[PDB]
Design goal:
Blueprint lengths: L3 E8 L6 E6 L5 E6 L3 E6 L5 E7 L4 E6 L6 E6 L3 E6 L4 E7 L6 E7 L5 E7 L9 E7 L4 E6 L8 E6 L5 E6 L3 E6 L4 E7 L5 E6 L5 E6 L3 E6 L6 E6 L8 E4 L5 E4 L6 E3 L5 E4 L6 E4 L7 E4 L7 E8 L4 E7 L4 E7 L1
Antiparallel strand pairs: 1-30, 2-3, 3-4, 4-5, 6-7, 7-8, 8-9, 10-11, 11-12, 12-13, 14-15, 15-16, 16-17, 18-19, 19-20, 20-21, 22-23, 24-25, 25-26, 26-27, 28-29, 29-30
This protein binds ligand ZI8.
The ligand O=C(NC1(c2ccc(Cl)cc2)COC1)c1ccc(N2CC[C@H](O)C2)cc1 binds next to strand 7 and strand 9.
Subunit structure: Interacts with WDR81; involved in early to late endosome cargo transport. Interacts with BECN1; negatively regulates the PI3 kinase/PI3K activity associated with endosomal membranes.
Family: Belongs to the WD repeat WDR91 family.
Protein name: WD repeat-containing protein 91
Length: 334
């Protein structure tokens, strides 16, 4: 067995379906956001303890931790704004209007060196062909520097990830296209059709010879980063990995969530991958003629919609978040 399960705990302060759940850079704090606009900052080591909590008056759609200033958290709204929140001072340092016509801040990514961040800003959802923009910001001044043109047309970018040094940014969009941006030259280095439907999550492999993606068509694909649109491997995931995630009752009433947060997460070496399931997290060994689960974390009574995996002090922690608002924290030893 690759992992020893040390334990499983539950964080139950959210009373609404989870949108996002991310561990900070220190590997000690979580910022979780639910669909009611409640943002919680909490610790889990040595015990579960809420550090900060707030109800947003306006809609909140994305969150991203700072990479050098651990306590700083970026919050993207649904009213065209980016909030910088100091989790130690329990106060907003600023709120900047990220222009107009595109109020949905769907994605936020902080560059590894701490000098910049990117955000995706999209128009209201009317069709799948809805316009969007990709903005580059300076963290020192909290000012927008530029906007990257998207070809063939403006489109909603759903997910963003930087590579280790921060000179490349991989993005996934609502048109199913993956765009790789050179961050030194500020241009699209590569782009290809990745999915038949929306791209939900993107990540660079640990060796950075590939990029992983998960999309609306239910596929988990590994792409060759040196040869545009060339596949390294491809897998059809179970439907409860990509949703729509549905929570029903006996009332006729049901809640339906399409992926918004991280749909996959990786161990420190990028050899294992954590995914969603109706019952809890499912981990697959990567590089294995189909893909088979090696660890099922369980513990959920409502569909898991977003996951995270962090490693700190040679101890891995898996976050699995569900539609009833429950967040399970599974401790994994190598
Ligand atoms: O906190 C500010 N920057 C730093 C930073 C680091 C990481 C991230 Cl992700 C974002 C920002 C650069 O080191 C801290 C910071 C705070 C307030 C500022 N205002 C307030 C009034 C104006 O809007 C400028 C500017 C800048």
């Amino acid at each position: 067995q690759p992992f020893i399960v040390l334990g499983q705990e539950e964080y139950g302060e959210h009373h609404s379906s989870i949108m996002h759940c991310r561990v900070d850079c220190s590997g000690r704090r979580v910022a979780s956001l639910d669909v009611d606009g409640v943002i919680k900052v909490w610790s889990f080591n040595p015990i579960m303890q809420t550090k900060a909590s707030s109800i947003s008056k306006s809609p909140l759609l994305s969150l991203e931790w700072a990479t050098k200033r651990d306590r700083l958290l970026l919050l993207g709204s649904g009213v065209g704004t980016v909030r910088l929140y100091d989790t130690e001072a329990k106060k907003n340092l600023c709120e900047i209007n990220i222009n107009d016509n595109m109020p949905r801040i769907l994605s936020l990514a902080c560059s590894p060196n701490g000098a910049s961040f990117v955000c995706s800003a999209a128009a209201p959802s009317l069709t799948s062909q809805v316009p969007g923009r990709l903005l580059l910001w300076d963290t020192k001044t909290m000012k927008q520097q530029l906007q990257f043109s998207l070809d063939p047309e403006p489109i909603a970018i759903n997910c963003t990830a930087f590579n280790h040094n921060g000179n490349l940014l991989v993005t996934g969009a609502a048109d199913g296209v993956i765009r790789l941006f050179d961050m030194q030259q500020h241009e699209c280095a590569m782009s290809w059709r990745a999915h038949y439907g929306e791209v939900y999550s993107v990540e660079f492999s640990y060796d950075e010879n590939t990029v992983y993606s998960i999309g609306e068509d239910g596929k988990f694909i590994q792409w060759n980063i040196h040869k545009s649109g060339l596949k390294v491997s491809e897998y059809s995931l179970p439907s409860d990995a990509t949703g729509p995630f549905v929570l029903s009752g006996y009332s006729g009433y049901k809640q339906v969530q399409v992926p918004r947060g991280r749909l996959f997460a990786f161990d420190s070496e990028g050899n294992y991958m954590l995914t969603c399931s109706a019952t809890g997290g499912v981990i697959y060994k990567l590089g294995g003629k189909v893909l088979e689960s090696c660890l099922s974390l369980g513990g959920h009574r409502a569909p898991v919609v977003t996951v995270d995996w962090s490693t700190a002090m040679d101890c891995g922690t898996c976050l699995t978040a569900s539609m009833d608002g429950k967040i399970k924290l599974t401790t994994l030893l190598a």
